[PDB]
Design an enzyme around this catalytic site. Structure first.
Site, PDB file in Angstrom:
ATOM      1  CG  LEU A   1      -2.323  -0.653   1.055  1.00 13.44           C
ATOM      2  CD1 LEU A   1      -3.274   0.234   0.315  1.00 13.44           C
ATOM      3  CD2 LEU A   1      -2.242  -1.967   0.322  1.00 13.44           C
ATOM      4  CG  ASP A   2       1.391   4.188  -3.403  1.00 14.79           C
ATOM      5  OD1 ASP A   2       2.392   3.444  -3.441  1.00 14.79           O
ATOM      6  OD2 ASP A   2       0.989   4.844  -4.386  1.00 14.79           O
ATOM      7  CB  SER A   3       2.989   7.453   1.226  1.00 17.40           C
ATOM      8  OG  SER A   3       4.273   6.980   0.856  1.00 17.40           O
TER       9      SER A   3
ATOM     10  CG  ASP B   1      -2.768   3.822  -1.817  1.00 14.63           C
ATOM     11  OD1 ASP B   1      -2.384   4.970  -2.121  1.00 14.63           O
ATOM     12  OD2 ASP B   1      -3.145   2.981  -2.659  1.00 14.63           O
ATOM     13  CB  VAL B   2      -1.113   3.292   4.770  1.00 16.63           C
ATOM     14  CG1 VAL B   2      -0.429   4.552   5.290  1.00 16.63           C
ATOM     15  CG2 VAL B   2      -1.257   2.268   5.877  1.00 16.63           C
TER      16      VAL B   2
END
Ligand code: CDL
Ligand code: 3PE
Ligand code: PLC
Lengths: 85, 163, 83, 106, 52, 71, 124, 246, 54, 44
Positions: A41-43, A45-46
Site C-alpha cells: 500500500l502506498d503512502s 493509501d495507508v
C-alpha cells in the site's frame, strides 16, 4: 447494550481490507501483515485505510497515532484499546 | 378537594419528597411517584379548565402577608383565570409527558432521583409563576425557574461544557 | 452500563443507582405522608378560597364610587385630561 | 522541504487526511463525497514527484492556503471525543480512600 | 451483524410499532382530508366580502 | 337595533366589541357559554354575527372608496 | 506577551516569568495532560493573566477573526433594518376604513368625561 | 397566546422524537450528517416527527395551521400601514421553516445511509416509556388547534377578557380585508418549498453541495449563529473581564 | 429489573428532628389560635408583660 | 475510479434504493383514501 470483541474487530478490519481495490491480493491479508510491505500500500493509501477504519469503528485517530500503525495487528490492538468504538 | 390548592401543592411534593427521601426510596419509586403526582395535577387542571369554560369565574387563593410596609402591601395571592389556565394546560401536559418519557430515556443514568426532583421543581416554580396574582409572586417564580434551569443544564456536572 | 463508585459518599439523593433493598416498604411510608400532606393542605386552605366575581353587591360598588366622588368634590379635583 | 523524506511523508499524509476530513465535513451527499475524494486523491497524485525545492515549497504553501480557505465552521466529531456531545459525561469517579484532616472530628 | 460491506437485511420492527404507525398516519391523513373538505371555501379564499 | 348603554353594560360586553352589531354578540356568547365553546356548536349565532360584521366591513370599504374618490 | 493587557503588565513583574499566553481551549485535546479537563501539566508556569486563558475562561472562536465577525454582524443588522425601512415606503394602501363606535367613540365607556373627550374616546 | 399553547405541544413532540432518534444510534450522535437511511428502521419515530413537522409548517387541518397562518395574516390586516413589511418578513420566516424541517426529515430518513454498518444493524425503536408520550402528543398536535380555535380566536369570544383598545382591535379587518393571494400564498409556498427541497436533495445534490468560496463564507456566517456568540464573547464578556482586571 | 442497594431505614434522625419540630410548631400555632377563640387571647400573649407606655 | 467502490455498494442496494428508501413515507394513506371515500358516501 452492544459490546465488540477482539475477533469482531479483526473480522471487520479483514473485510474492510478485502473491500479495498488498491490491494495486491485478498488471500494474503494476515493479522500481522504489513500494509506497506506485504499488501504494497502506498503512502497515501495507508492514510485512506486509516480513515476507513475510523469511519468504520466511529472513532477519531490523531495524526501522531495514525502514522504509527504499520501492521494489521497494530490496528486491531489500537481499536481494542479504545473504550468507545 | 380544592383545585387551586392541589395544583400548587402536588408538584411541590413531587419536587421536595425526592430531595428528602431519595436515599430511602430509590429512583424506581421516585420516578413512578413524581410521574404520578404530575399526572394527577394535569388531570385536576383539565377539569378546572372544563368548568371555567362552563363559567368564567376564576378561583382566588389569598394567603398570608409578605410585606405590609408604608404603602406597599404584598400578599401571597394566586388566581387561576383564562390566561393562567391556558398556560397551565401547556405546563402540566408537557410536564407529565416529559416525566413519563424520562423513565425510559434516563433508565441507565446513575443520578435519576436528582433529575426527576429537578424536573418536578421546574414544574412547581413555573406553576407559581403563572398563578400568582401580583408581580411579586411572578418574580418569585421567575427567579426560581432560572435556578432550576441552572441545575438542569449542568445536570452532567463533570462535563465542562455543560457547566 | 455501570461502574464502581465510592460507597462512603452519602448523599441525600442516594448517590449512584440508589435502589435500596427495602424500597417498597419505604415507598408505602412516603406515599402515606404525601397523601396526608396534600389532603391537609387542600382542606386547610379551603377557607381562603373564593371566587372573583359576584362577591360584592352592586349596592356597595355604586355607593363606594359615589363616596369617592363626594371626596373628590370636597377637595378640588378635576378629572384626567379635564383642563 | 525534501522532495522525498520521512518528514515530507508525514506532512503530506497529515495534509491528505485533512483534505478528506474537510471534504466529508462539507459535502452532505455520500456519492458526491466519494466523487470529490477521488478527485482529491488525483490532485495529490499529480504533484507527487516534484523534486526542485522552490516548486515543492510553493505547492505545499498553496495547498495549505487552499485548505485554510476551505476550513469547516464545525467538523463532525464522534460524541465520545473532545469535541463530542458526550465527552466527559458521567465520568466514573476515581476510587479513593478518605484522608483524615482532624484528630477529633471526621 | 452477520454481513459486512454487504447488502443489509430488511429491518425487524415490532408489530405494535407498525400498527401504531398505521393508526397515526391514517388518522393524520383522514383528519386533514376532513378539514380540507369542511373548510375548502374559507381556507382557499372565496366569497369575497367586498361589495361587487 | 343598536343596544342600550345600560344593556351593553349589563351584558358586560368588551369595549372593542361594542358596535352596531353587539346585539347579535349577546346571544352568541350565551350559547358559547352553554356549550363549552365547542367548534361544532353555536353555528347559527356565530354565522349571524359574522354576517353583521360583513355588513359593517362593507360599509367601511365604501367609505374608503368615497374618501379615495375625493382625492 | 501577545495581547495589550498582558503587555501592560510587563513593568509589573520583577523576577516573574514572562510567559507567552495560549488559550487552553486551543491546545490540542489528544495530547496527554496531568489534568485532562484543564489541559494542564503539573508545574507548568502560568501567565500573569492566566485566569483569562484557562479552560474556564470565555470561549474563543477561530473560524473568523473578531474584526471580520464584527463586520458581518453589523452588516446583517444594517441590511435587515435598512431594507425594512425602505420597504415601508413602497407599501399598498388599505381598502376599508378603520372602524368606528357609537357615542362619539364610547368616550364614556373608556372612562372619559364631557370636559375631556380627546384623551379617552374612539374614532366615533 | 393561542400560538404559545399550540406550539408547546408539537415542539415537545419534535424534541422527544429527536431524543428517540439519538438513542437509536450506538454512537448516540446528534449530527444530522451522520444519519441517513433510517425510514425503514424507525417508522414510528418517523411518523411522530413527521406529524410534528407538518404541524409546525402549518399544513392544512393541523394545529399549527390555526395559529401560525392567522398570525401571519394579522400583520397584513393590521391598521398600521408600515406593518405590511412585517408580512413579508414573517412569510419568509415561514418558508424558511419548511426548508430546515424537510432538511432534517430527508437527512435523517430518506437520504442514503451515512453511518457505518453496525449502527444500522443495531438501530431499533425505543421502549414504551418513550413511545406512549409521543403518541399522546401526536394526537394533541393533530387535534388541539381545531378543537380549541373558538375559545381563543372566535368572533366575539369573551374567555380571555383582556381590554383591547377599540381603535386597536382589528381581528375582523384581518379576515374580511384579506385577499386570495395573501391568504393562500404562505400555504402554497410551504407545500412547494417542501417538495422542492426533497426533490433537489434526491436528484440535484450539487446545488446544495457546491464549493463556492463566497457561498461557503455566508454559510459559515449562518452556521456560527450570525456570529453573535463570538460578538458577545469577545466584545462584551472578554472586554468586561479585561476591564475588571484593570 | 435493576439491582438492589442495601436497605436503609426510612426515618433517619434528620427526618425525625425536622418533621417533629415543624409539626410541633404547627400544632402549637393551632392550639394558640383555639385557646384564643375560647379564652379571648393567645396563650403566648399571657407571658408578655412589658412596662406600661406611661 | 473508486478503489473503495466495493465498500460503498451497500449504501445504494436493497433497503436503500430510491424505491425502498421512499417506501412508507406516507403511512396509512391508503386507509385514509378508503375512509374519506366512505365518509363522502355516508355523508350523503
Ligand atoms: C413551618 C415550621 C418550620 C419552622 C422552622 C422548622 C425548622 C426546624 C429545623 C430542625 O428540625 O432543627 C434542626 C436544627 C439543627 O439541625 P440538624 O438537623 O441537627 O443538623 C445536623 C445534621 O445535619 C442532622 O443530620 P444529617 O447530617 O444526617 O442531615 C443531613 C442534612 C442534609 O444535608 C444537606 O445538604 C442540607 C442542605 C441544606 C438544608 C438546609 C435548608 C433546609 C430547608 C428546609 C426545607 C425547604 C423546603 C422548601 C420550602 C418548604 C416550606 C415549608 O439534613 C438537613 O439538615 C436537612 C433536613 C431537611 C429535612 C426535611 C424533611 C422534613 C420532613 C417533612 C415531613 C412532612 C410530614 C407531613 C405529614 C402530614 C400529616 C398530616 O436545630 C434547631 O432546632 C434549630 C432551631 C432553628 C429554629 C428556626 C430559627 C428561627 C429563629 C431564627 C431567628 C428568627 C428570624 C430572624 C430574626 C433576626 C433578628 C430579629
Ligand atoms: C425553598 C428552599 C428549598 C430548599 C431545598 C432543600 C434541599 C434539601 C435536599 C437537597 C439535596 C440535594 C443534593 O444532595 O444533591 C447533591 C448533588 C449530588 O447528588 P447525587 O445526584 O445523588 O450524586 C452525584 C454524585 N454523587 O450535588 C449537586 O449536584 C448539587 C445540587 C443541589 C440541588 C439543591 C436543590 C435546591 C436548589 C434551590 C436552592 C435555592 C436557594 C435559595
Ligand atoms: C409549604 C407550601 C405552602 C403550604 C401552605 C399551606 C397553608 C395551610 C394553612 C395556611 C394558614 C396561613 O397561612 O395563615 C397565616 C397566619 C395568619 O394569616 P391570616 O391573616 O389570618 O390569613 C391569611 C389570608 N388572608 C390574609 C388573605 C386572610 O399567619 C402565619 O401563620 C404566619 C406565621 C409566620 C411564621 C414564620 C415563617 C415560617 C416559615 C417556615 C418556612 C419553612
Amino acid at each position: 447494550a452492544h459490546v465488540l470483541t477482539k475477533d469482531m474487530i479483526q473480522e471487520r478490519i479483514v473485510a474492510l481490507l478485502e473491500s479495498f481495490d488498491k490491494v495486491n491480493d485478498a488471500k494474503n491479508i494476515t493479522a500481522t501483515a504489513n500494509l506497506t510491505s506485504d499488501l504494497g500500500l502506498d503512502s497515501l493509501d495507508v492514510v485512506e485505510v486509516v480513515m476507513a477504519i475510523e469511519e468504520e469503528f466511529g472513532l477519531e485517530i490523531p495524526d501522531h497515532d495514525a502514522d504509527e500503525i504499520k501492521t494489521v495487528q497494530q490496528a486491531i490492538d489500537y481499536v481494542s484499546a479504545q473504550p468507545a468504538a | 378537594y380544592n383545585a387551586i390548592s392541589l395544583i400548587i401543592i402536588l408538584p411541590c411534593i413531587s419536587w421536595l419528597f425526592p430531595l428528602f427521601f431519595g436515599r430511602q426510596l430509590g429512583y424506581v419509586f421516585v420516578t413512578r411517584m413524581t410521574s404520578t403526582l404530575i399526572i394527577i395535577t394535569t388531570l385536576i387542571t383539565y377539569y378546572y379548565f372544563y368548568q371555567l369554560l362552563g363559567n368564567n369565574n376564576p378561583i382566588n387563593l389569598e394567603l398570608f402577608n409578605y410585606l405590609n410596609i408604608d404603602y406597599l402591601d404584598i400578599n401571597y395571592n394566586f388566581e387561576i383565570d383564562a390566561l393562567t389556565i391556558t398556560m397551565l394546560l401547556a405546563i402540566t401536559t408537557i410536564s407529565s409527558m416529559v416525566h413519563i418519557y424520562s423513565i425510559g430515556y434516563m433508565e441507565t443514568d446513575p443520578h435519576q432521583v436528582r433529575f426527576f426532583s429537578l424536573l418536578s421543581m421546574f414544574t412547581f416554580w413555573m406553576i407559581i409563576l403563572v398563578t400568582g396574582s401580583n408581580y411579586f409572586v411572578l418574580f418569585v417564580g421567575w427567579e426560581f425557574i432560572g435556578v432550576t434551569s441552572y441545575l438542569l443544564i449542568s445536570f452532567w456536572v463533570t462535563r465542562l461544557q455543560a457547566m | 452500563g455501570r461502574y464502581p463508585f465510592p460507597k462512603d459518599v452519602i448523599s441525600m439523593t442516594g448517590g449512584w443507582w440508589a435502589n435500596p433493598s427495602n424500597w417498597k416498604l419505604n415507598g408505602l411510608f412516603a406515599t402515606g405522608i404525601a397523601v396526608g400532606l396534600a389532603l391537609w393542605v387542600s382542606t386547610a386552605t379551603l377557607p381562603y378560597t373564593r371566587r372573583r366575581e359576584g362577591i360584592t353587591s352592586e349596592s356597595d360598588i355604586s355607593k363606594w364610587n359615589a363616596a369617592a366622588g363626594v371626596w373628590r368634590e370636597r377637595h378640588g379635583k378635576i378629572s384626567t385630561g379635564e383642563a | 522541504p525534501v522532495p522525498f523524506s520521512a518528514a515530507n511523508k508525514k506532512l503530506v499524509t497529515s495534509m491528505y487526511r485533512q483534505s478528506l476530513k474537510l471534504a466529508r465535513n462539507w459535502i452532505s451527499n455520500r456519492q458526491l463525497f466519494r466523487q470529490k475524494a477521488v478527485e482529491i486523491r488525483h490532485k495529490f497524485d499529480q504533484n507527487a514527484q516534484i523534486s526542485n525545492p522552490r516548486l515543492l515549497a510553493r505547492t505545499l504553501d498553496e495547498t495549505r492556503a487552499h485548505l485554510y480557505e476551505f476550513r469547516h465552521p464545525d467538523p463532525i466529531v464522534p460524541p465520545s471525543f473532545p469535541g463530542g456531545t458526550k465527552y466527559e459525561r458521567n465520568v466514573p469517579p476515581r476510587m479513593e480512600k478518605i484522608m483524615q484532616h482532624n484528630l477529633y472530628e471526621p | 451483524n452477520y454481513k459486512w460491506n454487504g447488502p443489509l437485511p430488511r429491518p425487524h420492527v415490532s408489530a405494535g410499532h407498525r400498527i401504531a404507525t398505521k393508526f397515526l398516519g391514517a388518522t393524520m391523513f383522514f383528519w386533514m382530508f376532513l378539514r380540507i373538505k369542511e373548510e375548502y371555501p374559507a381556507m382557499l379564499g372565496l366569497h369575497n366580502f367586498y361589495p361587487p | 337595533p343598536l343596544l342600550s348603554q345600560e344593556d351593553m353594560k349589563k351584558h358586560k360586553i368588551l369595549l372593542a366589541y361594542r358596535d352596531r352589531c353587539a346585539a347579535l354578540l349577546v346571544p352568541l356568547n350565551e350559547c358559547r357559554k352553554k356549550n363549552y365553546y365547542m367548534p361544532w356548536a353555536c353555528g347559527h349565532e356565530r354565522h349571524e354575527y359574522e354576517m353583521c360584521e360583513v355588513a359593517d366591513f362593507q360599509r367601511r370599504v365604501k367609505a374608503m372608496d368615497k374618501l379615495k374618490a375625493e382625492k | 506577551i501577545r495581547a495589550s493587557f498582558d503587555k501592560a503588565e510587563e513593568p509589573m513583574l520583577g523576577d516573574y516569568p514572562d510567559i507567552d499566553p495560549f488559550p487552553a481551549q486551543l491546545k490540542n485535546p489528544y495530547k496527554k495532560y496531568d489534568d485532562q479537563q484543564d489541559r494542564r501539566n503539573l508545574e507548568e508556569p502560568l501567565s500573569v493573566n492566566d485566569d483569562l486563558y484557562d479552560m474556564w475562561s470565555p470561549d474563543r472562536f477561530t473560524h473568523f477573526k473578531n474584526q471580520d465577525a464584527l463586520k458581518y454582524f453589523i452588516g446583517f443588522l444594517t441590511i435587515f433594518f435598512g431594507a425594512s425601512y425602505v420597504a415601508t415606503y413602497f407599501v399598498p394602501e388599505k381598502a376599508a376604513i378603520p372602524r368606528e363606535f357609537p357615542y362619539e367613540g364610547l368616550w364614556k365607556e373608556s372612562g372619559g368625561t364631557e370636559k375631556s373627550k380627546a384623551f379617552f374616546g374612539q374614532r366615533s | 397566546l393561542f400560538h404559545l399553547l399550540g406550539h408547546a405541544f408539537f415542539k415537545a413532540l419534535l424534541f422527544m422524537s429527536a431524543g428517540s432518534i439519538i438513542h437509536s444510534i450506538l454512537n448516540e450522535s446528534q449530527d444530522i450528517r451522520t444519519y441517513g437511511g433510517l425510514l425503514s428502521y424507525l417508522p414510528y419515530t418517523y411518523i411522530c416527527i413527521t406529524i410534528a413537522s407538518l404541524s409546525l409548517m402549518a399544513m392544512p387541518g393541523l394545529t399549527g395551521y390555526y395559529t401560525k397562518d392567522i398570525i401571519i395574516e394579522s400583520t397584513y390586516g393590521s391598521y398600521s400601514i408600515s406593518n405590511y413589511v412585517v408580512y413579508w418578513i414573517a412569510y419568509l420566516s415561514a418558508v424558511l421553516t419548511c426548508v430546515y424541517s424537510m432538511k432534517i426529515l430527508y437527512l435523517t430518513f430518506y437520504s442514503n445511509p451515512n453511518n457505518n454498518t453496525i449502527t444500522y444493524y443495531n438501530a431499533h425503536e425505543s421502549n414504551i416509556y418513550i413511545t406512549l408520550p409521543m403518541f399522546i402528543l401526536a394526537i394533541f398536535a393533530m387535534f388541539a388547534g381545531w378543537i380549541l380555535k373558538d375559545i381563543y380566536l372566535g368572533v366575539g369570544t369573551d374567555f380571555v377578557g383582556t381590554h383591547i383598545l377599540p381603535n386597536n382591535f382589528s381581528y375582523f379587518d384581518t379576515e374580511f380585508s384579506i385577499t386570495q393571494f395573501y391568504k393562500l400564498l404562505p400555504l402554497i409556498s410551504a407545500i412547494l418549498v417542501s417538495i422542492l427541497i426533497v426533490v433537489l436533495n434526491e436528484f440535484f445534490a450539487i446545488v446544495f453541495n457546491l464549493n463556492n468560496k463566497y457561498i461557503n463564507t455566508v454559510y459559515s456566517i449562518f452556521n456560527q449563529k450570525l456570529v453573535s456568540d463570538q460578538i458577545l464573547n469577545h466584545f462584551i464578556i472578554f472586554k468586561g473581564l479585561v476591564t475588571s482586571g484593570n | 429489573g435493576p439491582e438492589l442497594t442495601p436497605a436503609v431505614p426510612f426515618f433517619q434522625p434528620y427526618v425525625l428532628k425536622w418533621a417533629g419540630v415543624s409539626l410541633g410548631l404547627v400544632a402549637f400555632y393551632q392550639f394558640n389560635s383555639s385557646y384564643e377563640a375560647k379564652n379571648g387571647h393567645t396563650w403566648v400573649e399571657t407571658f408578655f408583660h412589658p412596662k406600661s407606655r406611661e | 475510479k473508486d478503489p473503495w467502490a466495493r465498500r460503498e455498494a451497500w449504501r445504494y442496494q436493497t433497503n436503500f434504493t430510491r424505491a425502498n428508501r421512499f417506501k412508507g413515507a406516507a403511512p396509512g394513506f391508503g386507509i385514509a383514501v378508503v375512509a374519506f371515500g366512505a365518509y363522502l358516501a355516508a355523508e350523503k
